[PDB]
């Protein structure tokens, strides 16, 4: 015979710990509206137990602490009672501050501030609260740096990082860039702390597509595996990979360093899987870091393949794009196997909820980049279904505006609206602006003068929005992007590329023509090794050699070899016929001039069948 209602204190407390930890074991097993009330029943009990110990008992300062903390952790991760959790943490803090001069309470007091300034305002996700947290987090840091002890200098660095992380949430992007440098500039060089904060900076710039300043780029390259440890290093490797993919560079060296890494540290991510990364800044200042996609071996290879697959999207027609049509669906299944086989724990159900939600976004990237690979290879938007938001802002109304331009509809309305609204990334703003300048410049050529006064007007605007969003992002260092800017300027400011070329100076022609020479000399059907080389994008390579062959080539055997090629390429992707035609007129001249008789005859038949198709019913 046993009691159930007059229990030792350690039994009450171990029962709160059991109801929680049992929920942590059935977290990945909720499948019903019922099972949800079972999960949150076990949590309701655990919260109200910890409340009992706080009200119906006399607790020491260390027991108020370890208990109040364990309870607040659950309020924060399981409820919406954020106002409440902030009561407990401020009370515990205000109590610990009464005993703070006769008892050692720095770890507890810093951990309280961390809850008020970091853990809580992030779960709240409220601009009003963020704005207050920052007011307070600054007041804290501005106050601690005036204490010379080595502890308070390390805690200020911790809250200097909490200060930054909030500005990112408040989207105060200048403060972010300024503070990150003042924080990094103070950190002891080649320390795991500076290298973590730096990995945060680089990854912050990539999220906003900001250009990555040089010192940060070297700080990233100089990360040493043995000072930062396999978790943070697999993050450094992820970031470099992403940097290439962003400048459309080559990722072979990177996929190989990842293999050298994986050959000697795979078990670190599988055996240690779950235990996270702990950044010991000091004795009694240790921060834990969890990056689930990047740190767990399986979860990393799935991400890492989607990147390898997004680089090869543009190769599409008949080789490396066979890698993408083979490996984008495996992302989808290996991503789907990570959802079906999600295991607790022992973390909240909502921890596993959000890790599922990221897996669901990875699913949506794949259903997108298949529609893109189908729009490269076939020259039309498969549109299909509807119930998806696009894994990004308006990748749907970009895909949908493109389906309008494909249908000759101009889509000047859609591209301005998409590049006007603040929610869209800076890159998709640019893709929308170029396609606009392309359609507006096309009209200046093929429109009368009646409509042209208004349309010369538009082409000027849309060109400068492009001059802008290009100069403040990292696209300005992507060769495929800088070149597409050249191609379009020359096509619009030179005959015979526009019927009504736009006015320009002799200096501006000298500029752009000298540019094209660097691109042309380095990508023409005679391939090298340098910063001007381009991924084999079909439409891009074809225009570079029409444009370039037509302006910079003088020998006539040369000019025949090139136009022969450009002309045959155009069949590799769909939706290219009207370009194939303008190329065939060009080849047709070069044949007649060079007196290649038969060629002038075949090219006539090839052009006759294109006119037949271009004007079909």
């Amino acid at each position: 015979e046993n009691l159930g209602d007059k229990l030792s204190i350690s039994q009450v407390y171990h029962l709160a710990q059991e109801y929680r930890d049992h929920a942590y074991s059935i977290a990945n097993k909720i499948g019903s509206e019922e099972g949800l009330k079972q999960y949150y029943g076990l949590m309701n009990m655990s919260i109200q137990m910890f409340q009992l110990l706080k009200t119906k008992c006399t607790l020491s300062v260390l027991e108020d602490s370890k208990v109040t903390f364990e309870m607040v952790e659950l309020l924060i991760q399981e409820t919406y009672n954020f106002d409440l959790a902030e009561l407990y943490i401020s009370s515990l803090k205000e109590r610990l501050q009464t005993h703070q001069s006769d008892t050692d309470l720095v770890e507890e007091i810093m951990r309280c501030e961390f809850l008020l300034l970091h853990d809580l305002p992030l779960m709240r996700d409220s601009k009003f609260h963020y704005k207050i947290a920052l007011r307070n987090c600054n007041e804290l840091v501005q106050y601690m740096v005036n204490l010379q002890d080595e502890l308070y200098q390390n805690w200020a660095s911790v809250f200097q990082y909490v200060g930054v992380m909030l500005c990112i949430k408040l989207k105060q992007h200048r403060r972010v860039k300024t503070s990150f440098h003042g924080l990094l500039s103070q950190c002891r060089e080649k320390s795991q702390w500076k290298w973590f904060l730096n990995l945060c900076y680089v990854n912050y710039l990539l999220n906003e597509r900001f250009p990555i300043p040089e010192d940060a780029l070297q700080e990233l390259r100089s990360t040493e595996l043995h000072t930062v440890g396999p978790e943070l290093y697999a993050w450094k490797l992820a970031l470099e990979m992403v940097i290439q993919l962003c400048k459309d560079g080559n990722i072979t060296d990177h996929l190989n360093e990842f293999k050298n890494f994986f050959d000697t540290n795979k078990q670190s991510l599988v055996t240690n899987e779950g235990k996270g990364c702990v950044i010991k800044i000091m004795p009694r200042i240790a921060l834990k870091v969890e990056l689930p996609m990047i740190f767990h071996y399986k979860e990393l290879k799935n991400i890492l393949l989607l990147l390898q697959s997004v680089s090869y999207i543009v190769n599409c027609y008949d080789e490396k794009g066979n890698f993408s049509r083979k490996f984008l669906p495996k992302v989808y299944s290996t991503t789907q196997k990570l959802i079906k086989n999600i295991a607790a724990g022992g973390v909240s159900m909502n921890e596993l909820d959000s890790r599922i939600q990221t897996y669901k976004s990875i699913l949506e990237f794949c259903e997108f980049y298949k529609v893109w690979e189908q729009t490269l290879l076939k020259g039309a938007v498969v549109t299909t279904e509807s119930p998806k938001l696009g894994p990004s802002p308006g990748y749907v109304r970009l895909l949908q505006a493109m389906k309008v331009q494909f249908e000759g509809g101009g889509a000047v309305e859609e591209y301005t609206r998409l590049a006007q609204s603040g929610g869209t990334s800076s890159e998709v703003k640019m893709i929308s602006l170029l396609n606009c300048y392309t359609v507006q410049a096309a009209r200046v050529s093929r429109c009368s003068g009646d409509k042209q006064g208004e349309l010369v007007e538009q082409c000027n605007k849309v060109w400068l929005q492009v001059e802008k969003l290009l100069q403040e992002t990292d696209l300005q260092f992507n060769p495929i992007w800088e070149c597409t800017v050249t191609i379009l300027w020359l096509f619009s400011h030179f005959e015979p590329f526009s019927w009504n070329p736009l006015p320009c100076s002799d200096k501006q022609r000298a500029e752009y023509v000298s540019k094209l020479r660097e691109f042309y000399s380095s990508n023409k059907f005679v391939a090298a090794d340098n910063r001007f080389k381009l991924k084999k994008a079909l439409l891009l390579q074809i225009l570079v050699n029409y444009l370039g062959g037509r302006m910079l080539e003088h020998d006539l055997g040369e000019i025949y070899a090139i136009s022969a090629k450009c002309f045959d390429m155009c069949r590799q992707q769909g939706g290219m016929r009207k370009v194939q035609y303008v190329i065939g007129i060009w080849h047709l001249m070069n044949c007649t001039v060079a007196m290649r008789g038969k060629d002038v005859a075949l090219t006539n038949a090839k052009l006759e069948a294109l006119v037949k198709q271009i004007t079909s019913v």
Binding site: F262, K301, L305, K330
Partner: peptide
């Protein structure tokens, strides 16, 4: 390539 492609582990498991």
């Amino acid at each position: 390539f492609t582990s498991d």
